[PDB]
Amino acid sequence: KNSVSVDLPGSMKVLVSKSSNADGKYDLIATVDALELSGTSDKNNGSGVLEGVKADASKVKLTISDDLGQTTLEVFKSDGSTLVSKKVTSKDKSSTYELFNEKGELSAKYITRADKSSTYELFNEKGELSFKYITRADKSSTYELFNEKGELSAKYITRADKSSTYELFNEKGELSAKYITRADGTRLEYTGIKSDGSGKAKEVLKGYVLEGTLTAEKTTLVVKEGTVTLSKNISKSGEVSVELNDTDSSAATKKTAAWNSGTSTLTITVNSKKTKDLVFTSSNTITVQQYDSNGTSLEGSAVEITKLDEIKNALK
Amino acid sequence: KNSVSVDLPGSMKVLVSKSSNADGKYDLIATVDALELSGTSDKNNGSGVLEGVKADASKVKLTISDDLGQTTLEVFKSDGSTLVSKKVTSKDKSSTYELFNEKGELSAKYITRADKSSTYELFNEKGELSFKYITRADKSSTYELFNEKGELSAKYITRADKSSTYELFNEKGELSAKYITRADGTRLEYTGIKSDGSGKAKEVLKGYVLEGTLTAEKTTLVVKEGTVTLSKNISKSGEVSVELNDTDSSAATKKTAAWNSGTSTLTITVNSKKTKDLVFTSSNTITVQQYDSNGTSLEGSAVEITKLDEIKNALK
């Protein structure tokens, strides 16, 4: 009887007999699940086919490749044809796992790649994808809900940075709404999104919200006070730029502004003097600081804005 | 320009003038998104109705009850009657939030209670529930997926201790499969579940698996060695108990056993001597420890079983 043993992909062990049988082949034994499997092989390395029959007549089949590079574990009904499950594991620790219904067709499928990223897919009665979960190397997680046409109904994404994205889709599976919650709890909300990617935009900050529009390229959020319009643009990416336009025609009172991307600061000028800096911080806040009477140096300290009225006051 | 701030349920604030008007009424100002609402009231306490119209002609209405006990915030389309959103909040910290699609019909409903027990519901075009998310006070999360017709097809529960339950339901709404993953990664798997609650059971432990049956009253997992049958029962209510029968008729060799539910221990006897204790531990492991030749005291130390063959050896 007793000889040596061999580790296999998927945390299984096979015992391989010393000495050959009547065909010059080696006996193989492995206990997998609650079942002792047995087989014979050409080789003495632990590769080959082992089989067993469970108490309920299910047929089990473990196939170990010649180089020990992979294992396939199949469970069939009495038939020996219709699958119950199928697990293919690589020496990577990478693996596929398929679960079948009593028709012998795919109910669910789990994949994990070498880099630790994985998919779970749940199929329905119609052999159609109902839900899907995807994990990537960047430690993001995606949850996808499908309608009875296999189009997206909803999608939820969580990221490493602690932010999330929740997407809702219309009857045709086109994106209709998108809600982005930043790590800090501030939000960008897009609604009424059309087939060209245009829509309504809202940014939810601490103490106030900005509203505006979405287009293919950018998000433009707008604050208006009298003749002055302030626009905060947020890139197709995630980049902030800011501009100001004043329809005031009098050179004594007309506001203009310069944007400095490097410092995230809009500097307002009136009548050839700088009047204030608006800083758009990495904390998703806005600060305001006034210049001195020469429009030369900054005066006092920057003040954090806490409501929309204060932005408007700064634009007067 | 001479008001007081009044804090309102749903984390809002309202400004009230303490000076009357051409009706004996007071002025109300509040900001919701980037919209200034206004209204007037009999009362000077911050209660009443505030309204506003957005740039896109959306109608906004804030209703504050007389005792400041409840706020209702409604957003309507330009027609002033089809709902875009509706948020009802009580001072009890409880809230309901309803979101409607471009259509004007209920898309999503979010209910929060005082303890943070909250329910999120997502509806399809047919007015039917597609998905539900329920969090409780105990830190547990439930995810419910519904079919076309809007009845449960899959349910995923996560508890505080990192354990989970995953349930799959058939076309008829009946539970067909159920997978319990314990905090420590051991699993109970129930498959082919019939209309009477009976089915196939598998317990997946560290290093081995046990199989058996599910009936309405219990799960019975069995290991057989020679004439000996060991049965691990897991009751409807989750209580583990253990039994052994030996068909051997000789007093010299027949195993009998006693189960002590207080110590989670099966003591085996042969020929009037205790031979070993099998402990079924809180970590979902089995240990084995032999008695001395008197059957009086345990010898050595308890040994953790790691493979099915070791259970069978203990039964020899």
H-helix or E-strand spanning residue A65 = none
Interface membership of A168 toward B (CB under 8 Å) = yes
**Tokens describing residue B226:** 């020679």
Q: Using CB atoms within 10 A of its CB, is residue A67 exposed (0-12), middle (13-18) or buried (19+)?
A: exposed
Task: Count, in order, helices (H) and strands (E) of chain A.
Answer: 1, 27
Kindly compute the dihedral angle of the four CA atoms of residues B98, B99, B102, B107, in this order, to the nearest 10 degrees. -90
Reported for A190-194, long-range contacts at CB under 8 A and 24+ positions apart, including other chains, are A190/A214, A190/A219, A192/B102
- Report residue A59: phi and psi, to 5°: -100, 130
Dist. CA A35–CA A231, nearest whole Å: 69
**Tokens describing residue A39:** 């087989």
Q: After which residues is chain A broken (C to N over 2.5 A)?
A: none
Cβ neighbour number for residue B171 with a 10 Å cutoff = 12
Distance between first and last Cα of chain A: 95
Looking at chain A, list the stretches that DSSP marks H as alpha helix, in order from N- to C-terminal side.
Answer: 308-315
Contacts of A192 in chain B (CB under 8 A): 102
Kindly write down the DSSP assignment for every residue of B251-281, as one continuous string: TTT-EEEEEETTTTEEEEEETTEEEEEEEE-
Dist. CA B144–CA B180, nearest whole Å: 16
CB contact under 8 A, B171 and A125: yes
Distance from the Cα of A238 to chain B's closest Cα (Å) equals 22
Please say whether the beta carbons of B124 and B137 come within 8 A.
Answer: no
Dist. CA B200–CA B215, nearest whole Å: 9
Residue A155 half-sphere exposure toward CB, CA atoms < 13 A: 17
Method: X-ray
Find residue A113's DSSP bridge partners. Answer: none
Dist. CA A271–CA A253, nearest whole Å: 6
Dist. CA B108–CA A145, nearest whole Å: 15
Please say whether the beta carbons of A257 and A237 come within 8 A.
Answer: no
Distance from the Cα of A273 to chain B's closest Cα (Å) equals 30
Of the candidates B131, B200, B307, the beta carbon closest to that of A145 is on: B131
Distance from the Cα of B260 to chain A's closest Cα (Å) equals 26
Dist. CA B210–CA B220, nearest whole Å: 10
| Contacts of residue A157, Cβ cutoff 8 Å, sequence gap at least 6 | A140, A141, A142, A143, A164, A165, A166, A167
DSSP state of A215: -
Q: Identify the three-state secondary structure at position B312.
A: helix
Find residue B247's DSSP bridge partners. Answer: none
Dist. CA B16–CA B38, nearest whole Å: 10
CB contact under 8 A, A34 and B202: yes
- Which residue has 């969090």 as its token pair? B135
Q: Give the mutation candidate from A7, A11, A14, A31 for the B interface (greatest B CB count, under 10 A).
A: A31
Contacts of A106 in chain B (CB under 8 A): none
Dist. CA B292–CA B302, nearest whole Å: 13
Dist. CA B266–CA B95, nearest whole Å: 53
Residue B43 half-sphere exposure toward CB, CA atoms < 13 A: 12
Chain B residue with the nearest C-alpha to that of A54: B211
| Contacts of residue B85, Cβ cutoff 8 Å, sequence gap at least 6 | B73, B74, B75, B97, B98, B99, B100
- Report residue A261: phi and psi, to 5°: -60, -40
Please say whether the beta carbons of B112 and B133 come within 8 A.
Answer: no
- Report residue A86: phi and psi, to 5°: -150, 120
Handedness of CA A16, A17, A21, A27 (dihedral sign): negative
Dist. CA B69–CA B209, nearest whole Å: 57
Q: In what order do the strands lie in the sheet with B265-270?
A: B255-260, B265-270, B273-280, B286-290, B303-304
Overall resolution, Å:
2.0
Dist. CA B203–CA A302, nearest whole Å: 64
Q: Where are the beta strands (DSSP E) in B12-163?
A: 12-17, 26-31, 36-41, 48-53, 59-64, 70-76, 83-90, 95-100, 106-112, 118-123, 129-135, 141-146, 152-158
Q: CA-CA distances (angstroms) from residue B283 to B110, B185, B186?
A: 38, 10, 9
Per DSSP bridges, beta strands A59-64 and A240-246 are: unpaired
- Report residue B77: phi and psi, to 5°: -65, 175
Contacts of B209 in chain A (CB under 8 A): 33-34
Query: A35: closest CA among A51, A11, A18?
Result: A51
Kindly compute the dihedral angle of the four CA atoms of residues B289, B293, B296, B298, in this order, to the nearest 10 degrees. -20
Q: Identify the three-state secondary structure at position B17.
A: strand
Dist. CA A37–CA A58, nearest whole Å: 12
Cβ neighbour number for residue A103 with a 10 Å cutoff = 10
Q: Amino acid letter at A198?
A: S
Dist. CA A29–CA B231, nearest whole Å: 25
Please say whether the beta carbons of B35 and B27 come within 8 A.
Answer: no
- Report residue A295: phi and psi, to 5°: 65, 35
- Report residue A149: phi and psi, to 5°: -100, 5
Q: CA-CA distances (angstroms) from residue A60 to A30, A81, B192, B210?
A: 12, 11, 18, 16
Handedness of CA B301, B304, B307, B312 (dihedral sign): positive
Q: After which residues is chain B broken (C to N over 2.5 A)?
A: none
Dist. CA A33–CA A53, nearest whole Å: 12
- Checking phi first, is residue A185 left (phi over 0); if not, alpha (psi -120 to 50) or beta? left
- Which residue has 């989750």 as its token pair? B238
Per DSSP bridges, beta strands B12-17 and B26-31 are: antiparallel
Contacts of A223 in chain B (CB under 8 A): 34
Dist. CA A26–CA A18, nearest whole Å: 7
Dist. CA A108–CA A130, nearest whole Å: 10
- Checking phi first, is residue A195 left (phi over 0); if not, alpha (psi -120 to 50) or beta? alpha
Interface of A with B in 106-125 (CB under 8 A): 107, 122, 124-125
Please say whether the beta carbons of A130 and A121 come within 8 A.
Answer: no
Dist. CA A133–CA B70, nearest whole Å: 39
What are the structural domain ranges in chain B?
Answer: 1-316
Cβ neighbour number for residue A54 with a 10 Å cutoff = 16
DSSP state of B314: H
Q: Amino acid letter at B43?
A: K
Q: Using CB atoms within 10 A of its CB, is residue B214 exposed (0-12), middle (13-18) or buried (19+)?
A: buried
**Tokens describing residue B246:** 């030996």
Find residue B231's DSSP bridge partners. Answer: B222, B243
Query: B217: closest CA among B193, B198, B192, B243?
Result: B198
**Tokens describing residue B140:** 């547990």
Query: B232: closest CA among B206, B256, B266?
Result: B266
Interface membership of B174 toward A (CB under 8 Å) = no
Cβ neighbour number for residue A298 with a 10 Å cutoff = 13
Residue B284 half-sphere exposure toward CB, CA atoms < 13 A: 18
CB contact under 8 A, B202 and A122: no
CB contact under 8 A, A153 and B211: no
Q: Amino acid letter at B274?
A: K
Kindly write down the DSSP assignment for every residue of B142-170, as one continuous string: EEEEE-SSSSEEEEEEE-TTS-EEEEEE-
**Tokens describing residue B195:** 């209309």
Reported for A148-156, long-range contacts at CB under 8 A and 24+ positions apart, including other chains, are A148/B148, A149/A173, A153/B122, A153/B124, A153/B130, A154/B122, A154/B130, A154/B131
